Design a protein around this ligand. Sequence first.
Ligand SMILES: [Mg+2]
Lengths: 48, 100, 143, 116, 111
Amino acid sequence: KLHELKPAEGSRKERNRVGRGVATGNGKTSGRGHKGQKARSGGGVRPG
Amino acid sequence: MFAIIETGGKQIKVEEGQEIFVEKLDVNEGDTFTFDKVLFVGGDSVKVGAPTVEGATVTATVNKQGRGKKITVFTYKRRKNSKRKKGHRQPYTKLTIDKI
Amino acid sequence: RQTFMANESNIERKWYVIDAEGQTLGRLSSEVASILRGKNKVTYTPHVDTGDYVIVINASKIEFTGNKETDKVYYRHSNHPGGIKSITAGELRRTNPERLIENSIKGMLPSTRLGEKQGKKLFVYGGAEHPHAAQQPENYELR
Amino acid sequence: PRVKGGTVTRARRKKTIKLAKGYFGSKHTLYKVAKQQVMKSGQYAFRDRRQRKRDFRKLWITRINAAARQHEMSYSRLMNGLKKAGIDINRKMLSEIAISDEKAFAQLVTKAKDAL
Amino acid sequence: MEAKAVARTIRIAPRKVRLVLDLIRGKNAAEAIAILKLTNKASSPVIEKVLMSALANAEHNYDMNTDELVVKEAYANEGPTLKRFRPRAQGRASAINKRTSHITIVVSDGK
RNA sequence: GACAAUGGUAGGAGAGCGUUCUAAGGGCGUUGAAGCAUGAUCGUAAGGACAUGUGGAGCGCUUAGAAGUGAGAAUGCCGGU
RNA sequence: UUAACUUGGGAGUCAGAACAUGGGUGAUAAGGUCCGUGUUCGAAAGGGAAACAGCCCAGACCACCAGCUAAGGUCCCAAAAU
RNA sequence: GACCGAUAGUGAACCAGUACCGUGAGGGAAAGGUGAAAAGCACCCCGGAAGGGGAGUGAAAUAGAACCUGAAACCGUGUGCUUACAAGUAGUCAGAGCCCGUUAAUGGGUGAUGGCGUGCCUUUUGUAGAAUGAACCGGCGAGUUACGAUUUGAUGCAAGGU
Ligand SMILES: [Mg+2]
């Protein structure tokens, strides 16, 4: 019924929220590394 | 008299009417257990004294089986992001000695 | 579990008097700094005061081998500037032989909240008499 | 919808302060000071479960050594014979025999000298 | 059986009061009226005027005699401040905290 | 039931607790909810209850959905001391 | 004995350091600086070197008041042979 | 309305572009809650008055206009254990002696004496560092959405899909 709904098996997925811990991995640097150009907000150079 | 039993990889000096920590055995409560491996049995006058003496067995009677107190295991390292945190309850077995 | 911890009213500490004549200085002070810590007895625990009271008479006839009588010196300071003072172990035997043994032993005693109480079970006398006859000691044949 | 910061900064900052009662001065009142003493008092305890096992063995050997010297034998002559004369199982927590019954501890010293 | 008389938000400081309240605690009530009338501080007649209300609310409306009374506890809590400023040199200004206090005297009669 | 593995920063992968809101099924509440306070309890961790006190009208649980979704530091910003 | 190549998804790193051993530069100078090969720190706790990221032994899944050993040690501080 | 609920949503729920700052254009905050009904404390008593304590209204004033619940920091008063010969990143593990009695389990508070032990982040080849940052407690405070691109997981059909 409607009070009991199951999704398709293997269809759904959580999402990675970075910067929200220290033991989740993506924390205190959010998966960019240390200093540089492409660890700045909006860095990373044009492709090609 | 007294006698030395070997229970959980270690040795316990026990006499009579005595209650003990022993690490976990395979018995239910209210049962009876038998230690077929005794080492130095005898007080002042009673002596055998032998390498793993044969013939004498020591009985027991199980009062309860449960778990010890929770020992929280924390470990961090400074300047870094490393940590761990666990918790542990080592299961024991309480006995009561009836005969040597 | 089954271990023993000897405490303040579970032990006695009886008396020893040791003739300190005819034997050297730091070979004597090891069978004294182990009597004061109590390693001649079972029911030795840490953190309490076991051991035995030790009395030393004939401090005037301890020995030295080689020129320690002239080339062993005892530097001390006084916390004013330029205050180091020197004294040798040949003039310390003749002047004050009560201090010479009493610092040969207290350099061998532990961390100094209880090692101050262990060291004060030691009575060092210069001659052959002692006023501690009211405490009933005995002779201790030390190796 | 706006998730307001609710009652989780009450409770998470109690169950650290309540672990840290019994400490001096401000290390039982403030959060930041009693936090980082709790991280060190579970680190000191981790190397003190491993050290406890080997510093009660620096005591059992001291009592046995102060038991064989009055029977005029070394310690290193005592845990030599009892591996070699008998197959007396290696035990040093059972220096409780030497404290309790001196008559019991004497026959082992007889058996150690007997086949060494 | 015991009375009290709480005076609150008196203009005086809270640390200069509890030097005088420290002095009379656990003493007979006949003396402590006449100790606050010989000390030359600034909070003595203020504390005195509230001790003579725990000695009139213990004789009236409880009907106990005022010859046996003893000061059980006397403590000075803290009331709200009045933040006024002081114009200080080179264009600065420092905050001056005029504090107020709560005074509570509790007498007893040993029962 | 045998034999195996399990230190780890940058970083890749997996598995979970919790918070506000909505839909559906069931339920406690003035014979006292939420919130706060004390406690010697339970789980491998985040975290869950229960027992008296204060409180005076609204709140949890099972499956799924959606996020202004988690604070010890930014000479961080307003308030208190 | 148990890895290795191929195709596609996602980042990091481009400041390295001592010790040992072949040589350059300097003065057969530096805890100097620049290259080849190996190890440890980097990212590694533990016992030893009195104290001491890099030297010597050895890689922590958690618990136990059991056992045998490595580098190094056995008078006393300080466990073990005056 | 799977939008906010007094540090939020308008700068503004309070008589707001107002106190206040500037010669001028211009800048600009702070504020909410008694109770169902004011039935908002008659009269006595200490006081010069404030502020109290009884008696009274009320379900409750330990809801009295400092007016719902009332956290921490910080200042107090009381008491069981403890400390005036000792060199302390303040804890930890081993432990006598004392006063107690819980969610009943091989319990709680206190700690004479012994062993080990140079805070936390950030940047570094390397920090106890005498390198950087925080007085303390409380709130607020950072990988988001859109329209495209490509790969992976699901699902519907499949020489056809939409
Ligand atoms: Mg400093």
